[PDB]
Amino acid sequence: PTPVEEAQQKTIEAITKAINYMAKRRIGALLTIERDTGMGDYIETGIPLNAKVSSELLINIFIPNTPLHDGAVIMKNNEIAAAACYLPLSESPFISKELGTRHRAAVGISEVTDSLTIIVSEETGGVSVAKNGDLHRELTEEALKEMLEAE
Amino acid sequence: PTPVEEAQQKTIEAITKAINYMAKRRIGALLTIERDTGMGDYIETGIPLNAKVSSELLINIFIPNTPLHDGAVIMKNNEIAAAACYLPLSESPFISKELGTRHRAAVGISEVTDSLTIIVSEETGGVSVAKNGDLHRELTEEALKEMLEAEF
Ligand SMILES: COc1ccnc(NN)n1
Ligand SMILES: [Mg+2]
């Protein structure tokens, strides 16, 4: 593997470790990975970080009742660009009616960008991914890894 | 003021806001500001962040029972270089006997660098600074801000 490929794999590993920790503890989380569609306007609504990715930093960001947990982390160029960012809420009538604004925000950004967003539910610890306007629910760890590698 | 001066003032405002929040809630914290003596050897022992400073990130780092809360945050100019860093423990007899590892680590790094370290006690909420081998305890918010402004 090249240094770029090793860097992507290390980032995937950091993401999945953090997601698993939060799912176990039913900590709500919202993590959007910018792709070809720029999301600077949304990044600018949050707290700037421009931080190296680590599972530890991701977990510390989403701790309940802390400054940085309310909103979305947005990742760009293999770094955490900002935390506590605003995402647009989807008006789609085809999202499961039991879900709240976290999932609607993930679907909403997925409607107007090619980004991939990961959501951890605070009600169940379930893990889902929003892309292209659809929400993929009740993912296993292997399913999430496959989506991150495919992306 | 120059951009460098404005950035310094922003970083001091972020630090003081974080320390004040943590002091009020008895959140233990250990925050070393690198000066002219390079601290790379200690930065390398922690989790790399290389992150822009904010009061919100500093507070989130030290929340008890989280991955990044144990060990020192080391700041380099206007960045949080790393968290959960090791610092050497001082054996100075002028550290109050009731104080724990955070204060001893702060004095310890202050004996081998020109850095300024801020400590929040999880027992009392009191704020102290370690510099040049000396620990100064029970600082007011004004005293801390003045110390930080004088450092730059
Ligand atoms: C890290 O990926 C995932 C997905 C679904 N559940 C979990 N852990 N309970 N991890
Ligand atoms: Mg006194």
UniProtKB/Swiss-Prot annotation, chain A:
Instruction: Give the principal location in a single coarse category.
Output: membrane
Q: What region holds the DAC domain?
A: 2-141
What's the Enzyme Commission number for this chain?
A: 2.7.7.85
Indicate where this protein resides in the cell. Cell membrane
Q: Which reaction does it catalyse?
A: 2 ATP = 3',3'-c-di-AMP + 2 diphosphate
Any one cellular-component term (Gene Ontology): plasma membrane
Output the GO biological process annotations, alphabetical, semicolon-separated: cAMP biosynthetic process
In the induction comment, the record states: Constitutively expressed, part of the cdaA-cdaR-glmM-glmS operon.
How is it placed in the membrane, per its record?
Multi-pass membrane protein
Keywords (A to Z) from UniProt = ATP-binding, Cell membrane, Membrane, Nucleotide-binding, Nucleotidyltransferase, Transferase, Transmembrane, Transmembrane helix
Q: Does the keyword Ribonucleoprotein apply?
A: no
Q: What happens when the gene is disrupted?
A: Increased sensitivity to the beta-lactam antibiotic cefuroxime (CEF), upon overexpression of the c-di-AMP phosphodiesterase GdpP greatly increased sensitivity to CEF. Double disA-cdaA mutants cannot be made, suggesting they are lethal, while double disA-cdaS and cdaA-cdaS mutants are viable. Depletion of cdaA in double disA-cdaA deletion cells leads to cell lysis. Exponentially growing cells are extremely sensitive to H(2)O(2), no change in response to methyl methanesulfonate.
Instruction: Describe regulators of its activity.
Output: DAC activity is stimulated about 20-fold in E.coli by coexpression with CdaR.
Task: Tell me one GO molecular function of this protein.
Answer: adenylate cyclase activity
Q: How does it assemble?
A: Probably a homodimer. Interacts with CdaR. May interact with GlmM.
Per the record, the similarity remark reads: Belongs to the adenylate cyclase family. DacA/CdaA subfamily.
Q: What does this protein do?
A: One of 3 paralogous diadenylate cyclases (DAC) in this bacteria, catalyzing the condensation of 2 ATP molecules into cyclic di-AMP (c-di-AMP). Upon expression in E.coli leads to c-di-AMP synthesis. Probably the main producer of c-di-AMP for the cell; is probably implicated in control of peptidoglycan synthesis. In B.subtilis c-di-AMP is a second messenger that mediates growth, DNA repair and cell wall homeostasis; it is toxic when present in excess.
**Could you tell me what this protein is called?**
Cyclic di-AMP synthase CdaA
Native source organism of the sequence: Bacillus subtilis (strain 168)
Tell me the part of the parent protein that is shown: 103 to 252 of 273
